[PDB]
């Protein structure tokens, strides 16, 4: 996790693609129930600074699932021999 | 108040009460906590700007003068932090390093005392005895301007209302400026090692 | 109407100014009972008066070992002299430990009851180990003294308590400075008087990082 | 200003500007009044027991933070013999850390007095929690004056818990309470700092500020984890 | 009303405090009922007195070989006493336990029925052997005693009781300490005196792995 590290950019990577699919519908937050195609855009809690739904549950799912992610892709990449 | 351009994202004066004492964080208190913050600001810009300019211009024997930082004795890189007065200073002043710093706690504490007290209770702090001191400092309904013999000794205020808000507005706004300036002053020291006015001649060739 | 610890402070209610040396200074309320209002003034006239012997011994032995005459620093003196002394030690600590316990039940059963020694249960004397006021005895204490006059009592009343706080100052004064020169306190002094502007306590090393 | 980050609703509906602290910062909900509702004592999950362990894990945390880093800036400087300056588990808290053999008796034996001691002292606690003002009727050594009590059992008063006696007023009072729970929520925060530098540096606090003060990139959350012990 | 074993502790409804040594500390609900009360004021009254004769006599003991009389200790006194006692052990043991089984139930059937041996079965005596009160005997029992008085009875019937509790504490002290150290309760006294700072319960080796 050295900074420059493909494995640090694309943990980086990870994490901002998630925060940006959750910042703006787009991904099953706290704001956004899940259907099988994820509507109807609900409301709990208060988001405590920047606007839409980005609570303290909701970055730190996100969190956790773009870490989760990030864990596949680098030993994915790693078993089949790339950076 | 002496301000208002509807400037707070964060909401950090909100407390739902109003009290002259504690709390610290009534209007009353932000304000005149602002605005001694900010003429300290630009004491502080004069004060790091000042022998910069006097010392390549040869007006003031150059010791030290296009480094605030190595004046005071500050380099964050000496062992611990860049507190003023650690420093290794180059140049010997008749007070060497740390008595300099007990003469300024002892007036600056005194100070403060005076004006802490004429916080909270005004008009008595000028009562009991002070080697005839006391006089020069008449009391007022306003904590951050006193005003009388001293501070507003020329009477460049005491003649009119509007004019007096205009010089207050003004001073604010420069003080701001001067908050931003020690910012910038504080980024460059901490960041560079090289004082400010050797950065704006950087940026201007 | 006083002049206070701090110009413009609110002076404290049980602090009226009818104490010696009454600035009012009690940011922690003590002395707020009246019980302990006569302990507190009882404790730190006994710490004052042994403060002030205490400085004046030291100085005294100071100006002599620096004049010329054989005497020890102020710090272990008693080291110096325990091993000359035909007294060893135990037997010295506990004499004084004695005594002063003595003196201390005395002046302390003073307090509780004032005039409860001045019964002549102690070698049959009344007007002599009374106590005239709290902490201020009465009758062989005061063979010459001018407390009969009662402006100069409360004078030097004044006066004994202002240099007892002096010297409260001065032996932690002294204190301070030994450990941080490990030299006389009458050198210190000399030292400062020689060069002001250099010798003080920024320069001695230790104290300052 | 108000609330905070998690800070979740139907949880600021039964708080707001009434206990000490009332920052409305309870994101899973342990100051409802429906918890432990019916008769009796029940449970500890109620807020008048958790607003008291608060309070008494606070000012243990700010006793322990004072304890931990004290003797360490003055071992630093001149001020208490760098023998007896040791770091704050090898004191003989934990043996296998390091203990002092220096001491006036065994670590043991000051264990037996401590547990006396504040048997004791959190007993008659207990006691006057479960009945307020109770340990001030039975003769206690002549003292039973100052364990009055008052109506919050957390803070008790009197001529000795308050000596000083000052913030009589309510708004002095309240700007105290909220002083004390704060710098106890820091103390708080400055415990747990205190365990995890010590288990993952095996050396002192200070000593990892000095660390982190000289080389940031290089002294820091990663590098030490990265490292020897940890 | 009365110091509680714990302050601020709710005393139990059975204990009303007119029972000697009645601190209310009762968590098992023992004693409860009234027959069962009487019995466990005996049996602690009982169990009291020969938790006092037992440690009295022990600390006798104890003094007399510190002070250079040849005596045993507390634990195998009487297995070091038999080798030179006339009275072998078998015989010993069942005289002690015929004439005891006499007296004990003798006071037995006194408990069960108050005075019941007070009718002159046992040589013809009426006024001794009589019980007065529920664990105190009269008559014979109280030659020169002050039981007469009923303030004087009462407060030495607390004080007894209080020095049966102490004594109970004291027999278990000895042997916890005796199975700690191997040494006699005066030598551990001893020990404790010469080095309160070291010598305790905790650098014994044993009860502290
Ligand atoms: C995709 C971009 C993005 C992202 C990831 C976030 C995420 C966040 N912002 Mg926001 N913000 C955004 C766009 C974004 N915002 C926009 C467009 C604006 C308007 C200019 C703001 C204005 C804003 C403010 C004013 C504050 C936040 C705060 C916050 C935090 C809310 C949770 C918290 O700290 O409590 C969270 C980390 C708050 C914060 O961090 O609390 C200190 C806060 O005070 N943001
Ligand atoms: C960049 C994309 C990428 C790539 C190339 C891989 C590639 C790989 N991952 Mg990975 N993964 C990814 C993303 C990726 N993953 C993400 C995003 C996640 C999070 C959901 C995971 C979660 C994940 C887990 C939990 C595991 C893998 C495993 C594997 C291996 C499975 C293929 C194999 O060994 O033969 C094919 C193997 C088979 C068993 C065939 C499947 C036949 C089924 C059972 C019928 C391979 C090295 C596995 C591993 O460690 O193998 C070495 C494993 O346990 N990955
Ligand atoms: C036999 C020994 C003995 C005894 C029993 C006392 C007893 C007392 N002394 Mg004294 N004292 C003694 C020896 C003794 N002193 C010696 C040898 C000295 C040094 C010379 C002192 C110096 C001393 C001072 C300076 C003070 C006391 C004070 C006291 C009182 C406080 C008791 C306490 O908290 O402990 C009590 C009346 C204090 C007092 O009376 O406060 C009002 C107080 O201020 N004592
Ligand atoms: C220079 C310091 C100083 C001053 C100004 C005073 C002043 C006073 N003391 Mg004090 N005293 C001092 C040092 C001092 N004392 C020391 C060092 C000791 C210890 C040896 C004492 C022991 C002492 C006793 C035992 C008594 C006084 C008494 C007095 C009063 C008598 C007036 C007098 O004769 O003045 C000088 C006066 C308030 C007497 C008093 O207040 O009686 C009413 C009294 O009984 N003082
Ligand atoms: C789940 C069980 C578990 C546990 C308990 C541990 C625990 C430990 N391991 Mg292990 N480890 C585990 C699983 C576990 N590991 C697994 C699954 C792996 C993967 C293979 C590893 C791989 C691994 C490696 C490779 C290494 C360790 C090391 C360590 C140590 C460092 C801990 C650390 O970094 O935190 C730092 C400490 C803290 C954060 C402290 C926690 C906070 C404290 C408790 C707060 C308490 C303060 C309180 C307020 C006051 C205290 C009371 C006071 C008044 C007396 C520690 C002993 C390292 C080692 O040997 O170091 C000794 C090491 O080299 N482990
Ligand atoms: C003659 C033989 C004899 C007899 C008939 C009894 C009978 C009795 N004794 Mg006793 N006892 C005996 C010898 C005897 N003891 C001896 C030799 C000793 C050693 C000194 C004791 C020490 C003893 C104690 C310490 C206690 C009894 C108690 C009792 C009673 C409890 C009986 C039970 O539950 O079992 C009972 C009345 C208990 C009692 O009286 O409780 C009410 C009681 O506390 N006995
Ligand atoms: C010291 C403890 C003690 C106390 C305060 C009492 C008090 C009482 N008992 Mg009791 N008793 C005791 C021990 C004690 N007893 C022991 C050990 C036994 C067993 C032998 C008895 C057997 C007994 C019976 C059978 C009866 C009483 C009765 C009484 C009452 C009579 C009042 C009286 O005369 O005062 C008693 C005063 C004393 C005992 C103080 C004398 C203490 C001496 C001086 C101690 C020294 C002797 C010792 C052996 C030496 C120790 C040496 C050591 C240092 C090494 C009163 C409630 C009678 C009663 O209640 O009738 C209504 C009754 O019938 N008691
Ligand atoms: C083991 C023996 C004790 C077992 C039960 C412990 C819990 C209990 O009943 O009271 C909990 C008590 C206080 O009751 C407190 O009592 C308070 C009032 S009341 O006494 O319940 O009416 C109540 O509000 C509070 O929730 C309760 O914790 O808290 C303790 O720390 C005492 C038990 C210590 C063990
Ligand atoms: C028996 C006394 C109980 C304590 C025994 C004890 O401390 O033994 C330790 C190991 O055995 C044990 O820990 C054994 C514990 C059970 C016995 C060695 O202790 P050490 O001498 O290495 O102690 C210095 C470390 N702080
Ligand atoms: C400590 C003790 C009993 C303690 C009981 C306790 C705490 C019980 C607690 C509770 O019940 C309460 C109160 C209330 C309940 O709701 C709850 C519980 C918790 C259940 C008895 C000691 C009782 C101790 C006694 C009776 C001691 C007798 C000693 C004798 C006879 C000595 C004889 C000798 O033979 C030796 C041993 C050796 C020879 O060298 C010398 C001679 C003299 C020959």
């Known amino acids: 996790s050295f900074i420059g590290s493909p494995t640090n950019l694309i943990m980086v990577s990870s994490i901002g693609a998630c925060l940006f699919a959750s910042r703006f519908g787009l991904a099953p937050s706290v704001r956004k129930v899940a259907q099988p195609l994820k509507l109807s855009d609900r409301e709990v809690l208060q988001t405590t600074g920047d606007p839409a739904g980005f609570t303290a549950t909701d970055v730190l799912a996100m969190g956790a699932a773009g870490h989760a992610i990030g864990v596949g892709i680098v030993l994915g990449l790693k078993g089949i021999g790339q950076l | 108040l002496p301000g208002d351009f509807g400037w707070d994202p964060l909401h950090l004066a909100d407390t739902n009460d109003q009290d002259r004492l504690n709390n610290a964080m009534s209007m009353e208190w932000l304000s005149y906590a602002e605005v001694i913050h900010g003429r300290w600001a630009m004491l502080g810009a004069v004060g790091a700007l000042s022998p910069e300019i006097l010392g390549k211009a040869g007006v003031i024997p150059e010791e030290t003068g296009l480094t605030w930082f190595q004046a005071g004795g500050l380099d964050s890189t000496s062992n611990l932090i860049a507190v003023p007065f650690t420093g290794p200073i180059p140049f010997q002043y008749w007070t060497d390093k740390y008595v300099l710093l007990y003469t300024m706690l002892v007036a600056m504490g005194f100070a403060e005392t005076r004006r802490w007290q004429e916080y909270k209770q005004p008009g008595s702090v000028q009562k009991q005895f002070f080697l005839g001191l006391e006089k020069l400092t008449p009391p007022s309904q306003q904590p951050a301007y006193p005003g009388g013999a001293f501070f507003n000794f020329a009477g460049l205020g005491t003649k009119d209302e509007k004019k007096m808000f205009e010089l207050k507005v003004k001073e604010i706004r420069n003080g701001r400026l001067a908050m931003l300036a020690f910012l910038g002053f504080m980024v460059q020291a901490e960041v560079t090692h090289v004082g400010p006015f050797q950065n704006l001649l950087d940026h201007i060739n | ?209 | 200003d108000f609330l905070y980050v998690g800070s979740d609703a139907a949880a600021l509906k039964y708080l707001d500007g009434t206990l000490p602290g009332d920052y409305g910062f309870d994101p899973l909900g342990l100051l409802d009044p429906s918890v432990s509702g019916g008769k009796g004592e029940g449970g500890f999950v109620n807020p008048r027991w958790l607003q008291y362990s608060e309070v008494i894990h606070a000012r243990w945390a700010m006793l322990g933070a004072a304890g931990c880093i004290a003797p360490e800036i003055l071992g630093k400087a001149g001020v208490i013999p760098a023998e007896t300056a040791v770091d704050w588990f090898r004191t003989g808290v934990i043996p296998p850390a390091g203990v002092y053999k220096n001491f006036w008796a065994d670590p043991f034996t000051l264990f037996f007095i401590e547990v006396v001691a504040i048997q004791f002292a959190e007993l008659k606690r207990l006691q006057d929690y479960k009945n307020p003002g109770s340990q001030s009727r039975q003769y206690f050594l002549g003292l039973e004056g100052l364990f009055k009590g008052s109506d919050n059992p957390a803070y008790p008063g009197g001529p000795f818990f308050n000596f000083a006696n000052f913030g009589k007023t309510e708004e002095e009072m309240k700007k105290l309470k909220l002083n004390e729970i704060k710098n106890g929520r820091l103390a708080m925060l400055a415990m747990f700092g205190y365990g995890a530098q010590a288990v993952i540096t095996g050396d002192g606090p200070f000593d990892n500020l000095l660390a982190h003060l000289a080389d940031p990139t290089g002294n820091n959350l990663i590098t030490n984890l990265g490292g020897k012990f940890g």
């Not at chain 3, 610890?5 to 104490?19: H, V």
């Not at chain 3, 210190?188 to 008087?193: E, G, I, K, P």
Request: avoid cysteine; charge should be negative.
């Open chain 3, 1 to 209: 109407d006083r002049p206070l610890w701090s110009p413009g402070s609110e002076p404290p209610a049980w602090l009226d100014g009818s104490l010696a040396g009454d600035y009012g200074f009690d940011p922690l309320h003590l002395s707020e009972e009246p019980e302990m209002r006569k302990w507190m003034v009882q404790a730190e006239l006994v710490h004052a008066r042994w403060a002030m012997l205490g400085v004046a011994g030291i100085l005294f032995t100071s100006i002599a070992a620096k004049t010329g005459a054989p005497f020890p620093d102020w710090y272990d003196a008693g080291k110096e002299a325990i091993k000359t002394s035909p007294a060893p030690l135990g037997s010295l600590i506990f004499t004084e430990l004695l005594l002063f316990g003595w003196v201390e039940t005395k002046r302390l059963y003073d307090l509780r009851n004032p005039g409860s020694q001045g019964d002549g249960s102690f070698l049959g004397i009344t007007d002599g180990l009374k106590g005239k006021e709290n902490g201020y005895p009465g009758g062989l204490f005061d063979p010459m003294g001018m407390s009969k006059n009662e402006a100069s009592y409360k004078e030097a009343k004044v006066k004994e308590i202002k240099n007892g706080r002096l010297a409260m100052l001065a032996f932690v004064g002294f204190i301070a400075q030994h450990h941080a020169t490990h030299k006389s306190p009458i050198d210190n002094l000399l030292d400062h008087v020689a060069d002001p502007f250099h010798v003080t306590f920024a320069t001695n090393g230790v104290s300052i990082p």
